[PDB]
Design a protein around this motif. Structure first.
Motif, PDB file in Angstrom:
ATOM      1  N   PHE A  65       0.817  -1.213   0.000  1.00  0.00           N
ATOM      2  CA  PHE A  65       0.000   0.000   0.000  1.00  0.00           C
ATOM      3  C   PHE A  65       0.856   1.271   0.000  1.00  0.00           C
ATOM      4  O   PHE A  65       0.606   2.208  -0.751  1.00  0.00           O
ATOM      5  CB  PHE A  65      -0.974  -0.039   1.213  1.00  0.00           C
ATOM      6  CG  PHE A  65      -1.681   1.266   1.499  1.00  0.00           C
ATOM      7  CD1 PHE A  65      -2.353   1.961   0.491  1.00  0.00           C
ATOM      8  CD2 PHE A  65      -1.712   1.768   2.776  1.00  0.00           C
ATOM      9  CE1 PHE A  65      -3.012   3.152   0.737  1.00  0.00           C
ATOM     10  CE2 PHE A  65      -2.372   2.994   3.047  1.00  0.00           C
ATOM     11  CZ  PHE A  65      -3.030   3.679   2.000  1.00  0.00           C
ATOM     12  N   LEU A  66       1.835   1.316   0.880  1.00  0.00           N
ATOM     13  CA  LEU A  66       2.665   2.503   1.052  1.00  0.00           C
ATOM     14  C   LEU A  66       4.138   2.247   0.637  1.00  0.00           C
ATOM     15  O   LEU A  66       4.920   3.176   0.484  1.00  0.00           O
ATOM     16  CB  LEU A  66       2.595   2.974   2.525  1.00  0.00           C
ATOM     17  CG  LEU A  66       1.339   3.664   3.101  1.00  0.00           C
ATOM     18  CD1 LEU A  66       1.454   3.718   4.633  1.00  0.00           C
ATOM     19  CD2 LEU A  66       1.078   5.064   2.535  1.00  0.00           C
ATOM     20  N   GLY A  67       4.498   0.980   0.454  1.00  0.00           N
ATOM     21  CA  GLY A  67       5.803   0.605   0.012  1.00  0.00           C
ATOM     22  C   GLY A  67       6.721   0.383   1.184  1.00  0.00           C
ATOM     23  O   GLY A  67       6.483   0.854   2.293  1.00  0.00           O
ATOM     24  N   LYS A  68       7.823  -0.287   0.863  1.00  0.00           N
ATOM     25  CA  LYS A  68       8.719  -0.915   1.824  1.00  0.00           C
ATOM     26  C   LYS A  68       9.388   0.079   2.762  1.00  0.00           C
ATOM     27  O   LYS A  68       9.642  -0.236   3.928  1.00  0.00           O
ATOM     28  CB  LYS A  68       9.752  -1.764   1.048  1.00  0.00           C
ATOM     29  CG  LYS A  68      11.083  -2.034   1.734  1.00  0.00           C
ATOM     30  CD  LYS A  68      11.027  -3.145   2.774  1.00  0.00           C
ATOM     31  CE  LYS A  68      12.395  -3.355   3.471  1.00  0.00           C
ATOM     32  NZ  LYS A  68      13.504  -3.531   2.465  1.00  0.00           N
ATOM     33  N   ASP A 128       2.568  -4.415   4.880  1.00  0.00           N
ATOM     34  CA  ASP A 128       2.182  -3.330   3.962  1.00  0.00           C
ATOM     35  C   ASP A 128       0.865  -3.681   3.299  1.00  0.00           C
ATOM     36  O   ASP A 128       0.568  -3.152   2.223  1.00  0.00           O
ATOM     37  CB  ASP A 128       3.284  -3.102   2.899  1.00  0.00           C
ATOM     38  CG  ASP A 128       3.252  -1.697   2.242  1.00  0.00           C
ATOM     39  OD1 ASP A 128       3.854  -1.588   1.137  1.00  0.00           O
ATOM     40  OD2 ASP A 128       2.667  -0.726   2.789  1.00  0.00           O
ATOM     41  N   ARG A 129       0.096  -4.581   3.916  1.00  0.00           N
ATOM     42  CA  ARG A 129      -1.249  -4.889   3.459  1.00  0.00           C
ATOM     43  C   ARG A 129      -2.282  -3.985   4.125  1.00  0.00           C
ATOM     44  O   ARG A 129      -2.165  -3.664   5.299  1.00  0.00           O
ATOM     45  CB  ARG A 129      -1.600  -6.323   3.761  1.00  0.00           C
ATOM     46  CG  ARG A 129      -2.892  -6.742   3.080  1.00  0.00           C
ATOM     47  CD  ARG A 129      -3.081  -8.188   3.190  1.00  0.00           C
ATOM     48  NE  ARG A 129      -2.530  -8.901   2.056  1.00  0.00           N
ATOM     49  CZ  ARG A 129      -2.541 -10.227   1.925  1.00  0.00           C
ATOM     50  NH1 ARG A 129      -3.035 -11.026   2.868  1.00  0.00           N
ATOM     51  NH2 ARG A 129      -2.030 -10.763   0.831  1.00  0.00           N
ATOM     52  N   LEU A 130      -3.276  -3.564   3.353  1.00  0.00           N
ATOM     53  CA  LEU A 130      -4.390  -2.736   3.854  1.00  0.00           C
ATOM     54  C   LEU A 130      -5.672  -3.447   3.573  1.00  0.00           C
ATOM     55  O   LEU A 130      -5.886  -3.956   2.476  1.00  0.00           O
ATOM     56  CB  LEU A 130      -4.444  -1.370   3.180  1.00  0.00           C
ATOM     57  CG  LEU A 130      -5.490  -0.370   3.661  1.00  0.00           C
ATOM     58  CD1 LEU A 130      -5.023   0.390   4.865  1.00  0.00           C
ATOM     59  CD2 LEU A 130      -5.805   0.583   2.525  1.00  0.00           C
ATOM     60  N   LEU A 131      -6.532  -3.489   4.585  1.00  0.00           N
ATOM     61  CA  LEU A 131      -7.747  -4.320   4.529  1.00  0.00           C
ATOM     62  C   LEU A 131      -8.928  -3.443   4.836  1.00  0.00           C
ATOM     63  O   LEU A 131      -8.898  -2.701   5.822  1.00  0.00           O
ATOM     64  CB  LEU A 131      -7.640  -5.466   5.534  1.00  0.00           C
ATOM     65  CG  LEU A 131      -8.902  -6.310   5.743  1.00  0.00           C
ATOM     66  CD1 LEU A 131      -9.426  -6.804   4.412  1.00  0.00           C
ATOM     67  CD2 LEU A 131      -8.667  -7.460   6.727  1.00  0.00           C
ATOM     68  N   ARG A 158     -19.980   2.798  13.382  1.00  0.00           N
ATOM     69  CA  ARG A 158     -18.888   2.310  12.555  1.00  0.00           C
ATOM     70  C   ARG A 158     -19.400   1.517  11.396  1.00  0.00           C
ATOM     71  O   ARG A 158     -20.098   0.540  11.609  1.00  0.00           O
ATOM     72  CB  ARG A 158     -17.943   1.494  13.389  1.00  0.00           C
ATOM     73  CG  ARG A 158     -17.251   2.353  14.403  1.00  0.00           C
ATOM     74  CD  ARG A 158     -16.326   1.529  15.230  1.00  0.00           C
ATOM     75  NE  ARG A 158     -17.008   0.692  16.208  1.00  0.00           N
ATOM     76  CZ  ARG A 158     -16.436  -0.308  16.861  1.00  0.00           C
ATOM     77  NH1 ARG A 158     -15.171  -0.631  16.636  1.00  0.00           N
ATOM     78  NH2 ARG A 158     -17.140  -1.007  17.734  1.00  0.00           N
ATOM     79  N   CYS A 159     -19.048   1.916  10.170  1.00  0.00           N
ATOM     80  CA  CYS A 159     -19.551   1.207   8.994  1.00  0.00           C
ATOM     81  C   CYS A 159     -18.492   0.545   8.121  1.00  0.00           C
ATOM     82  O   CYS A 159     -18.832  -0.416   7.440  1.00  0.00           O
ATOM     83  CB  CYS A 159     -20.400   2.127   8.114  1.00  0.00           C
ATOM     84  SG  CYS A 159     -19.432   3.362   7.230  1.00  0.00           S
ATOM     85  N   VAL A 160     -17.265   1.077   8.093  1.00  0.00           N
ATOM     86  CA  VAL A 160     -16.120   0.510   7.344  1.00  0.00           C
ATOM     87  C   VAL A 160     -14.967   0.338   8.324  1.00  0.00           C
ATOM     88  O   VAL A 160     -14.683   1.256   9.097  1.00  0.00           O
ATOM     89  CB  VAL A 160     -15.585   1.448   6.181  1.00  0.00           C
ATOM     90  CG1 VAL A 160     -14.519   0.746   5.347  1.00  0.00           C
ATOM     91  CG2 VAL A 160     -16.711   1.929   5.273  1.00  0.00           C
ATOM     92  N   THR A 161     -14.332  -0.834   8.296  1.00  0.00           N
ATOM     93  CA  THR A 161     -13.166  -1.197   9.105  1.00  0.00           C
ATOM     94  C   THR A 161     -11.960  -1.168   8.197  1.00  0.00           C
ATOM     95  O   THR A 161     -11.941  -1.826   7.161  1.00  0.00           O
ATOM     96  CB  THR A 161     -13.296  -2.669   9.660  1.00  0.00           C
ATOM     97  OG1 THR A 161     -14.394  -2.739  10.575  1.00  0.00           O
ATOM     98  CG2 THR A 161     -12.008  -3.152  10.388  1.00  0.00           C
ATOM     99  N   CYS A 162     -10.951  -0.380   8.543  1.00  0.00           N
ATOM    100  CA  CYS A 162      -9.757  -0.318   7.691  1.00  0.00           C
ATOM    101  C   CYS A 162      -8.580  -0.756   8.531  1.00  0.00           C
ATOM    102  O   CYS A 162      -8.335  -0.153   9.586  1.00  0.00           O
ATOM    103  CB  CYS A 162      -9.551   1.097   7.159  1.00  0.00           C
ATOM    104  SG  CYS A 162      -7.927   1.240   6.328  1.00  0.00           S
ATOM    105  N   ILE A 163      -7.887  -1.820   8.110  1.00  0.00           N
ATOM    106  CA  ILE A 163      -6.748  -2.365   8.879  1.00  0.00           C
ATOM    107  C   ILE A 163      -5.478  -2.364   8.049  1.00  0.00           C
ATOM    108  O   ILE A 163      -5.476  -2.806   6.878  1.00  0.00           O
ATOM    109  CB  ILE A 163      -6.977  -3.858   9.352  1.00  0.00           C
ATOM    110  CG1 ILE A 163      -8.320  -4.028  10.077  1.00  0.00           C
ATOM    111  CG2 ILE A 163      -5.904  -4.286  10.237  1.00  0.00           C
ATOM    112  CD1 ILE A 163      -8.556  -5.331  10.754  1.00  0.00           C
TER     113      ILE A 163
END
Ligand SMILES: O=C(O)c1cnn(-c2nc3cc(Cl)c(F)cc3[nH]2)c1
Ligand SMILES: [Fe+2]
Length: 212
Positions: free
Chosen positions: A26-29, A170-173, A131-136
């Motif tokens: 997502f944002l890089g190393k 670097d994973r976004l969920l 809360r409607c969207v969970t971002c991890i």
């Protein structure tokens, strides 16, 4: 990728169809590691909680947390993570469901200590709390779930099956926070760090201010 492309060519069509989305690298190393550093520096300097009470003499405890506003000294790439999650959401722009997302929580940084605890099956928001969207965002360098466990398993509901999501670096969920997406973290046998921000629906959040 600019937040707008990712948001419109991916986040939105995916969220509206599957209600769960994964953005890799997502944002890089370089930035990724910087966040890792700041999160580890929080751990090392004793800011985390207690840990979730799993088993109630010498009891067993789970994920430790800290809320981070994003402007704290030593927390700036996390702040920058947050601003970049905010950019993504804004470039969705009432294209996520029928939702008008007008705010969010501070960021819950989590450290699972690697002592075989996970997080029991749960729904982030069952009672209608806004809360409607969970971002991890996951920061685990060279994670192997076959060795360290810690897979996040979601039971998207109305469905024979689940989706297993590895807490990869670097994973976004993204996933709907409500009863549609029951989930759990399987036992983690290594330190497992993640950062969560929850987005509010204007209306549901607006009604919760009186009820809680
Ligand atoms: O790291 C994970 O994969 C993960 C998945 N759910 N989860 C989890 N932590 C949570 C903490 C609070 Cl306070 C909450 F209300 C809901 C939560 N949900 C963490
Ligand atoms: Fe959760």
């Amino acid at each position: 990728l600019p937040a707008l492309k990712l948001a419109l060519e991916y986040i939105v069509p995916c969220m509206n169809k599957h209600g769960i989305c994964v953005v890799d690298d997502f944002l890089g190393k370089e930035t990724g590691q910087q966040i890792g550093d700041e999160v580890r520096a929080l751990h090392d300097t004793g800011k985390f909680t207690d840990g979730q009470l799993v088993s109630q003499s010498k009891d067993i405890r789970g994920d430790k947390i800290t809320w981070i506003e994003g402007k704290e000294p030593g927390c700036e790439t996390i702040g920058l993570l947050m601003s970049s999650m905010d950019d993504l959401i804004r470039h969705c722009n009432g294209k996520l469901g029928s939702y008008k997302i007008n705010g969010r929580t501070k960021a819950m940084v989590a450290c699972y200590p690697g002592n075989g605890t996970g997080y029991v099956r749960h729904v982030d928001n069952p009672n209608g709390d806004g809360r409607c969207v969970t971002c991890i965002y996951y920061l685990n360098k060279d994670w192997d779930a076959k060795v360290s466990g810690g897979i996040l398993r979601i039971f998207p509901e109305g469905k024979a099956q689940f989706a297993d999501i590895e807490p990869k670096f670097d994973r976004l969920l993204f996933f709907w926070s409500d009863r549609r997406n029951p989930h759990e973290v399987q036992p983690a046998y290594a330190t497992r760090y993640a950062i969560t921000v929850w987005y509010f629906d204007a209306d549901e959040r607006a009604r919760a201010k009186v009820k809680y």
